[PDB]
Amino acid sequence: IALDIEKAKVIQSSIEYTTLKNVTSATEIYYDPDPTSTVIEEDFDTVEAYFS
Amino acid sequence: TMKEITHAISSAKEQVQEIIYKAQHNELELKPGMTLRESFEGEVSRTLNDARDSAG
Amino acid sequence: SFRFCLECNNMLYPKEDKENQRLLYSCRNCDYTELAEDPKVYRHELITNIGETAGIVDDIGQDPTLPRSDKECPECHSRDCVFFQSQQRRKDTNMTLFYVCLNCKKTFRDE
Ligand SMILES: [Zn+2]
Ligand SMILES: [Zn+2]
């Protein structure tokens, strides 16, 4: 591994501490009374595709 | 020798100006573990120290 | 931006009607209740950009200590402009410049 940069980068990624806060860009809370559907039109397609 | 020293100092100032433009247009490479401002400051300091050493 | 009671002036808190399955904003010192229009009850931004270009005033062209450039204004196409870097001053702030013309005062960049 010492003489190969790719494996070294793999090890470096495996060691470094990473939390959800590191990758999270924003968080939101919504009111949505239908578990099988949604109010947001943007996320409607993905949730309906998941439910089907 | 004074014209050589003046030319070296002017060249270093031109290089620092180019680095300033590159940093202001987001074209500057970032040294790992350092922010954009820190990398910019380190590069400028290194350029100026090299300028003084060359003139001396 | 959050609303307040129209007769008590106190802050209206979100509430849910069990029987109606609707979101409502209800005051706590009064029985006033108003229907909620948007479902976004709460939003928190981990990475934010506000405060970067919002720091604009109409009379920023009267400052003599500000450098004057010759960048072309997209709106007025004037030959005189004043530029400054980001007002937000976090440790990881970019060094991009914001150019303000003396007629339209539109903020733009060279990117
Ligand atoms: Zn009230
Ligand atoms: Zn103008």
PDB file of C-alpha atoms and ligand atoms in Angstrom:
ATOM      1  CA  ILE A   1       0.000   0.000   0.000  1.00  0.00           C
ATOM      2  CA  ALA A   2       2.858   2.402   0.747  1.00  0.00           C
ATOM      3  CA  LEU A   3       3.977   2.420  -2.898  1.00  0.00           C
ATOM      4  CA  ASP A   4       0.460   2.647  -4.405  1.00  0.00           C
ATOM      5  CA  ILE A   5      -1.460   5.915  -4.215  1.00  0.00           C
ATOM      6  CA  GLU A   6      -4.896   4.388  -4.874  1.00  0.00           C
ATOM      7  CA  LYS A   7      -4.820   1.911  -1.988  1.00  0.00           C
ATOM      8  CA  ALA A   8      -3.393   4.644   0.238  1.00  0.00           C
ATOM      9  CA  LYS A   9      -6.328   6.902  -0.639  1.00  0.00           C
ATOM     10  CA  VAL A  10      -8.698   4.021   0.117  1.00  0.00           C
ATOM     11  CA  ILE A  11      -7.121   3.593   3.557  1.00  0.00           C
ATOM     12  CA  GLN A  12      -7.253   7.346   4.178  1.00  0.00           C
ATOM     13  CA  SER A  13     -10.962   7.392   3.365  1.00  0.00           C
ATOM     14  CA  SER A  14     -11.514   4.376   5.619  1.00  0.00           C
ATOM     15  CA  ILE A  15      -9.779   5.999   8.604  1.00  0.00           C
ATOM     16  CA  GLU A  16     -11.134   9.561   8.593  1.00  0.00           C
ATOM     17  CA  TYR A  17     -14.134  10.235  10.819  1.00  0.00           C
ATOM     18  CA  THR A  18     -17.272  11.188   8.892  1.00  0.00           C
ATOM     19  CA  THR A  19     -20.682  11.934  10.396  1.00  0.00           C
ATOM     20  CA  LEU A  20     -24.101  12.654   8.941  1.00  0.00           C
ATOM     21  CA  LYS A  21     -23.636  16.348   9.736  1.00  0.00           C
ATOM     22  CA  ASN A  22     -20.593  16.414   7.439  1.00  0.00           C
ATOM     23  CA  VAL A  23     -22.615  15.536   4.330  1.00  0.00           C
ATOM     24  CA  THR A  24     -26.003  16.994   5.311  1.00  0.00           C
ATOM     25  CA  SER A  25     -26.693  20.281   3.514  1.00  0.00           C
ATOM     26  CA  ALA A  26     -30.066  21.215   5.035  1.00  0.00           C
ATOM     27  CA  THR A  27     -32.856  19.688   7.100  1.00  0.00           C
ATOM     28  CA  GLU A  28     -36.586  20.380   7.106  1.00  0.00           C
ATOM     29  CA  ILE A  29     -39.770  19.293   8.869  1.00  0.00           C
ATOM     30  CA  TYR A  30     -43.074  19.043   7.008  1.00  0.00           C
ATOM     31  CA  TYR A  31     -46.666  18.205   7.891  1.00  0.00           C
ATOM     32  CA  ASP A  32     -47.983  15.327   5.773  1.00  0.00           C
ATOM     33  CA  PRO A  33     -50.919  13.241   7.044  1.00  0.00           C
ATOM     34  CA  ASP A  34     -50.853  10.584   4.289  1.00  0.00           C
ATOM     35  CA  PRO A  35     -48.119   7.960   4.827  1.00  0.00           C
ATOM     36  CA  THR A  36     -48.767   6.517   1.352  1.00  0.00           C
ATOM     37  CA  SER A  37     -48.553   9.887  -0.436  1.00  0.00           C
ATOM     38  CA  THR A  38     -47.172  13.381   0.127  1.00  0.00           C
ATOM     39  CA  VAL A  39     -47.934  17.076  -0.159  1.00  0.00           C
ATOM     40  CA  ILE A  40     -44.651  18.193  -1.763  1.00  0.00           C
ATOM     41  CA  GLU A  41     -44.885  17.914  -5.543  1.00  0.00           C
ATOM     42  CA  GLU A  42     -41.100  17.737  -5.973  1.00  0.00           C
ATOM     43  CA  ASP A  43     -40.763  14.609  -3.820  1.00  0.00           C
ATOM     44  CA  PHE A  44     -44.115  13.177  -4.956  1.00  0.00           C
ATOM     45  CA  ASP A  45     -42.649  11.295  -7.924  1.00  0.00           C
ATOM     46  CA  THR A  46     -39.916   9.573  -5.908  1.00  0.00           C
ATOM     47  CA  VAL A  47     -42.188   8.557  -3.024  1.00  0.00           C
ATOM     48  CA  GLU A  48     -44.879   7.249  -5.377  1.00  0.00           C
ATOM     49  CA  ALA A  49     -42.280   5.289  -7.355  1.00  0.00           C
ATOM     50  CA  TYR A  50     -40.984   3.815  -4.095  1.00  0.00           C
ATOM     51  CA  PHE A  51     -44.504   2.844  -3.009  1.00  0.00           C
ATOM     52  CA  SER A  52     -45.090   1.084  -6.348  1.00  0.00           C
TER      53      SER A  52
ATOM     54  CA  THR B   1      22.984  44.958 -10.536  1.00  0.00           C
ATOM     55  CA  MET B   2      20.340  47.478  -9.483  1.00  0.00           C
ATOM     56  CA  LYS B   3      18.447  46.973 -12.734  1.00  0.00           C
ATOM     57  CA  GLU B   4      18.563  43.205 -12.167  1.00  0.00           C
ATOM     58  CA  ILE B   5      17.226  43.615  -8.629  1.00  0.00           C
ATOM     59  CA  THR B   6      14.467  45.944  -9.819  1.00  0.00           C
ATOM     60  CA  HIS B   7      13.496  43.514 -12.579  1.00  0.00           C
ATOM     61  CA  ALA B   8      13.355  40.596 -10.139  1.00  0.00           C
ATOM     62  CA  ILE B   9      11.187  42.544  -7.693  1.00  0.00           C
ATOM     63  CA  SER B  10       8.853  43.695 -10.474  1.00  0.00           C
ATOM     64  CA  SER B  11       8.512  40.126 -11.752  1.00  0.00           C
ATOM     65  CA  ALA B  12       7.632  38.921  -8.259  1.00  0.00           C
ATOM     66  CA  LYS B  13       5.020  41.658  -7.869  1.00  0.00           C
ATOM     67  CA  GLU B  14       3.516  40.677 -11.227  1.00  0.00           C
ATOM     68  CA  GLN B  15       3.368  37.048 -10.093  1.00  0.00           C
ATOM     69  CA  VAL B  16       1.611  38.074  -6.877  1.00  0.00           C
ATOM     70  CA  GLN B  17      -0.854  40.118  -8.930  1.00  0.00           C
ATOM     71  CA  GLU B  18      -1.588  37.091 -11.110  1.00  0.00           C
ATOM     72  CA  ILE B  19      -2.117  34.970  -7.994  1.00  0.00           C
ATOM     73  CA  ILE B  20      -4.524  37.611  -6.685  1.00  0.00           C
ATOM     74  CA  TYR B  21      -6.499  37.517  -9.931  1.00  0.00           C
ATOM     75  CA  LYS B  22      -6.606  33.712  -9.910  1.00  0.00           C
ATOM     76  CA  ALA B  23      -7.833  33.651  -6.308  1.00  0.00           C
ATOM     77  CA  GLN B  24     -10.462  36.305  -7.037  1.00  0.00           C
ATOM     78  CA  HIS B  25     -11.760  34.276 -10.000  1.00  0.00           C
ATOM     79  CA  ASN B  26     -11.818  30.932  -8.122  1.00  0.00           C
ATOM     80  CA  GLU B  27      -9.020  29.579 -10.338  1.00  0.00           C
ATOM     81  CA  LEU B  28      -6.609  29.009  -7.431  1.00  0.00           C
ATOM     82  CA  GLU B  29      -5.602  25.515  -6.359  1.00  0.00           C
ATOM     83  CA  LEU B  30      -6.172  24.786  -2.671  1.00  0.00           C
ATOM     84  CA  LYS B  31      -3.410  23.293  -0.546  1.00  0.00           C
ATOM     85  CA  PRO B  32      -4.857  20.318   1.382  1.00  0.00           C
ATOM     86  CA  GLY B  33      -5.641  21.036   5.013  1.00  0.00           C
ATOM     87  CA  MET B  34      -5.782  24.792   4.383  1.00  0.00           C
ATOM     88  CA  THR B  35      -8.585  27.113   3.335  1.00  0.00           C
ATOM     89  CA  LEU B  36      -8.569  29.246   0.197  1.00  0.00           C
ATOM     90  CA  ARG B  37      -7.409  32.305   2.139  1.00  0.00           C
ATOM     91  CA  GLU B  38      -4.676  30.360   3.942  1.00  0.00           C
ATOM     92  CA  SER B  39      -3.376  28.832   0.710  1.00  0.00           C
ATOM     93  CA  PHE B  40      -3.421  32.232  -0.997  1.00  0.00           C
ATOM     94  CA  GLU B  41      -1.520  33.860   1.869  1.00  0.00           C
ATOM     95  CA  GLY B  42       1.046  31.061   1.989  1.00  0.00           C
ATOM     96  CA  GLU B  43       1.685  31.243  -1.747  1.00  0.00           C
ATOM     97  CA  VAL B  44       2.078  35.029  -1.656  1.00  0.00           C
ATOM     98  CA  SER B  45       4.469  34.842   1.299  1.00  0.00           C
ATOM     99  CA  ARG B  46       6.575  32.187  -0.428  1.00  0.00           C
ATOM    100  CA  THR B  47       6.738  34.242  -3.629  1.00  0.00           C
ATOM    101  CA  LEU B  48       7.832  37.375  -1.774  1.00  0.00           C
ATOM    102  CA  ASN B  49      10.474  35.538   0.260  1.00  0.00           C
ATOM    103  CA  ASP B  50      11.867  34.031  -2.941  1.00  0.00           C
ATOM    104  CA  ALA B  51      11.924  37.527  -4.446  1.00  0.00           C
ATOM    105  CA  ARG B  52      13.989  38.916  -1.583  1.00  0.00           C
ATOM    106  CA  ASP B  53      16.350  35.937  -1.692  1.00  0.00           C
ATOM    107  CA  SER B  54      16.888  36.305  -5.444  1.00  0.00           C
ATOM    108  CA  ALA B  55      17.574  40.039  -5.209  1.00  0.00           C
ATOM    109  CA  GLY B  56      19.973  39.487  -2.325  1.00  0.00           C
TER     110      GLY B  56
ATOM    111  CA  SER C   1     -40.731  34.908   8.328  1.00  0.00           C
ATOM    112  CA  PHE C   2     -43.331  33.836  10.900  1.00  0.00           C
ATOM    113  CA  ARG C   3     -46.728  35.377  11.616  1.00  0.00           C
ATOM    114  CA  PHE C   4     -48.325  36.634  14.824  1.00  0.00           C
ATOM    115  CA  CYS C   5     -51.840  36.812  16.226  1.00  0.00           C
ATOM    116  CA  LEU C   6     -53.858  39.611  14.640  1.00  0.00           C
ATOM    117  CA  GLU C   7     -55.575  40.516  17.933  1.00  0.00           C
ATOM    118  CA  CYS C   8     -53.066  39.449  20.614  1.00  0.00           C
ATOM    119  CA  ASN C   9     -49.829  40.185  18.655  1.00  0.00           C
ATOM    120  CA  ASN C  10     -48.251  37.119  20.279  1.00  0.00           C
ATOM    121  CA  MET C  11     -46.476  34.446  18.275  1.00  0.00           C
ATOM    122  CA  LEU C  12     -48.645  31.815  16.595  1.00  0.00           C
ATOM    123  CA  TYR C  13     -47.460  28.244  17.081  1.00  0.00           C
ATOM    124  CA  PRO C  14     -48.167  25.406  14.629  1.00  0.00           C
ATOM    125  CA  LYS C  15     -50.801  22.872  15.619  1.00  0.00           C
ATOM    126  CA  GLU C  16     -52.483  19.822  14.106  1.00  0.00           C
ATOM    127  CA  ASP C  17     -56.204  19.039  14.272  1.00  0.00           C
ATOM    128  CA  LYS C  18     -56.653  15.329  14.975  1.00  0.00           C
ATOM    129  CA  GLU C  19     -60.209  15.206  13.626  1.00  0.00           C
ATOM    130  CA  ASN C  20     -59.486  17.346  10.546  1.00  0.00           C
ATOM    131  CA  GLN C  21     -55.884  16.279   9.772  1.00  0.00           C
ATOM    132  CA  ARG C  22     -54.950  19.880   8.979  1.00  0.00           C
ATOM    133  CA  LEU C  23     -52.108  22.147  10.063  1.00  0.00           C
ATOM    134  CA  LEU C  24     -53.075  25.270  11.992  1.00  0.00           C
ATOM    135  CA  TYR C  25     -51.299  28.157  13.705  1.00  0.00           C
ATOM    136  CA  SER C  26     -52.731  28.807  17.165  1.00  0.00           C
ATOM    137  CA  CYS C  27     -51.900  31.452  19.734  1.00  0.00           C
ATOM    138  CA  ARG C  28     -51.348  30.333  23.320  1.00  0.00           C
ATOM    139  CA  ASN C  29     -52.768  33.321  25.229  1.00  0.00           C
ATOM    140  CA  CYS C  30     -55.889  33.422  23.039  1.00  0.00           C
ATOM    141  CA  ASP C  31     -58.229  31.126  21.134  1.00  0.00           C
ATOM    142  CA  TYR C  32     -57.331  32.650  17.757  1.00  0.00           C
ATOM    143  CA  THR C  33     -56.408  30.054  15.140  1.00  0.00           C
ATOM    144  CA  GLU C  34     -55.624  30.479  11.446  1.00  0.00           C
ATOM    145  CA  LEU C  35     -55.186  27.937   8.670  1.00  0.00           C
ATOM    146  CA  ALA C  36     -51.652  27.091   7.590  1.00  0.00           C
ATOM    147  CA  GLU C  37     -50.860  27.575   3.909  1.00  0.00           C
ATOM    148  CA  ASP C  38     -47.428  25.945   3.637  1.00  0.00           C
ATOM    149  CA  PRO C  39     -46.340  22.539   4.993  1.00  0.00           C
ATOM    150  CA  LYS C  40     -42.762  23.701   5.731  1.00  0.00           C
ATOM    151  CA  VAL C  41     -43.100  23.962   9.497  1.00  0.00           C
ATOM    152  CA  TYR C  42     -39.369  24.275  10.194  1.00  0.00           C
ATOM    153  CA  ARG C  43     -36.197  24.591   8.124  1.00  0.00           C
ATOM    154  CA  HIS C  44     -32.553  24.558   9.218  1.00  0.00           C
ATOM    155  CA  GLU C  45     -29.670  25.210   6.823  1.00  0.00           C
ATOM    156  CA  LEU C  46     -26.402  23.446   7.623  1.00  0.00           C
ATOM    157  CA  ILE C  47     -24.564  25.397   4.899  1.00  0.00           C
ATOM    158  CA  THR C  48     -25.904  28.876   4.152  1.00  0.00           C
ATOM    159  CA  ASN C  49     -25.116  31.667   1.696  1.00  0.00           C
ATOM    160  CA  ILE C  50     -27.244  34.533   3.051  1.00  0.00           C
ATOM    161  CA  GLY C  51     -25.299  37.595   4.143  1.00  0.00           C
ATOM    162  CA  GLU C  52     -22.941  37.302   1.163  1.00  0.00           C
ATOM    163  CA  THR C  53     -24.624  39.638  -1.345  1.00  0.00           C
ATOM    164  CA  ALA C  54     -27.392  41.008   0.904  1.00  0.00           C
ATOM    165  CA  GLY C  55     -24.991  43.624   2.281  1.00  0.00           C
ATOM    166  CA  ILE C  56     -25.941  46.274  -0.280  1.00  0.00           C
ATOM    167  CA  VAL C  57     -26.874  49.924   0.239  1.00  0.00           C
ATOM    168  CA  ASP C  58     -27.951  52.498  -2.322  1.00  0.00           C
ATOM    169  CA  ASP C  59     -25.299  55.056  -1.302  1.00  0.00           C
ATOM    170  CA  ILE C  60     -22.292  52.713  -1.365  1.00  0.00           C
ATOM    171  CA  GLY C  61     -20.970  54.798  -4.263  1.00  0.00           C
ATOM    172  CA  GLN C  62     -20.327  57.731  -1.927  1.00  0.00           C
ATOM    173  CA  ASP C  63     -17.542  55.950  -0.020  1.00  0.00           C
ATOM    174  CA  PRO C  64     -14.155  57.451  -1.006  1.00  0.00           C
ATOM    175  CA  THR C  65     -12.131  54.585   0.500  1.00  0.00           C
ATOM    176  CA  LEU C  66     -13.575  52.025  -1.959  1.00  0.00           C
ATOM    177  CA  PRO C  67     -11.582  51.157  -5.094  1.00  0.00           C
ATOM    178  CA  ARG C  68     -13.009  52.206  -8.451  1.00  0.00           C
ATOM    179  CA  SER C  69     -12.783  49.905 -11.481  1.00  0.00           C
ATOM    180  CA  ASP C  70     -13.846  49.962 -15.139  1.00  0.00           C
ATOM    181  CA  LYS C  71     -15.849  46.729 -15.375  1.00  0.00           C
ATOM    182  CA  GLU C  72     -18.837  46.884 -17.711  1.00  0.00           C
ATOM    183  CA  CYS C  73     -22.249  47.043 -16.057  1.00  0.00           C
ATOM    184  CA  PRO C  74     -24.757  44.534 -17.502  1.00  0.00           C
ATOM    185  CA  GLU C  75     -27.629  46.975 -16.905  1.00  0.00           C
ATOM    186  CA  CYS C  76     -26.301  50.523 -17.365  1.00  0.00           C
ATOM    187  CA  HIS C  77     -23.084  49.727 -19.297  1.00  0.00           C
ATOM    188  CA  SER C  78     -21.337  52.530 -17.422  1.00  0.00           C
ATOM    189  CA  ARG C  79     -17.574  53.037 -17.528  1.00  0.00           C
ATOM    190  CA  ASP C  80     -17.284  53.616 -13.757  1.00  0.00           C
ATOM    191  CA  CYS C  81     -17.935  50.976 -11.106  1.00  0.00           C
ATOM    192  CA  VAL C  82     -17.076  50.200  -7.485  1.00  0.00           C
ATOM    193  CA  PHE C  83     -16.181  46.682  -6.361  1.00  0.00           C
ATOM    194  CA  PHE C  84     -15.762  44.952  -3.009  1.00  0.00           C
ATOM    195  CA  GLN C  85     -15.360  41.436  -1.676  1.00  0.00           C
ATOM    196  CA  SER C  86     -17.927  39.463   0.311  1.00  0.00           C
ATOM    197  CA  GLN C  87     -19.323  41.153   3.410  1.00  0.00           C
ATOM    198  CA  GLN C  88     -19.749  37.761   5.073  1.00  0.00           C
ATOM    199  CA  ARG C  89     -16.444  37.129   6.847  1.00  0.00           C
ATOM    200  CA  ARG C  90     -16.377  33.508   7.911  1.00  0.00           C
ATOM    201  CA  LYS C  91     -12.968  31.832   7.995  1.00  0.00           C
ATOM    202  CA  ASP C  92     -13.760  29.822   4.829  1.00  0.00           C
ATOM    203  CA  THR C  93     -15.250  32.710   2.843  1.00  0.00           C
ATOM    204  CA  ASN C  94     -14.493  32.976  -0.861  1.00  0.00           C
ATOM    205  CA  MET C  95     -12.666  36.049  -2.159  1.00  0.00           C
ATOM    206  CA  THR C  96     -15.018  36.758  -5.074  1.00  0.00           C
ATOM    207  CA  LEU C  97     -15.674  40.405  -5.912  1.00  0.00           C
ATOM    208  CA  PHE C  98     -19.049  42.133  -6.150  1.00  0.00           C
ATOM    209  CA  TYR C  99     -19.251  45.032  -8.597  1.00  0.00           C
ATOM    210  CA  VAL C 100     -21.726  47.881  -8.112  1.00  0.00           C
ATOM    211  CA  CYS C 101     -22.477  50.496 -10.758  1.00  0.00           C
ATOM    212  CA  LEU C 102     -23.288  54.101  -9.910  1.00  0.00           C
ATOM    213  CA  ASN C 103     -26.636  54.196 -11.772  1.00  0.00           C
ATOM    214  CA  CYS C 104     -28.394  50.836 -11.358  1.00  0.00           C
ATOM    215  CA  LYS C 105     -26.374  49.538  -8.363  1.00  0.00           C
ATOM    216  CA  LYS C 106     -26.766  45.952  -9.580  1.00  0.00           C
ATOM    217  CA  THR C 107     -24.467  43.467  -7.846  1.00  0.00           C
ATOM    218  CA  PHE C 108     -22.690  41.050 -10.185  1.00  0.00           C
ATOM    219  CA  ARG C 109     -19.466  39.054 -10.458  1.00  0.00           C
ATOM    220  CA  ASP C 110     -16.759  38.379 -13.037  1.00  0.00           C
ATOM    221  CA  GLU C 111     -17.330  34.601 -12.893  1.00  0.00           C
TER     222      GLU C 111
HETATM  223 ZN    ZN D   1     -52.698  35.886  21.957  1.00  0.00          ZN
HETATM  224 ZN    ZN D   2     -25.068  52.563 -14.497  1.00  0.00          ZN
END
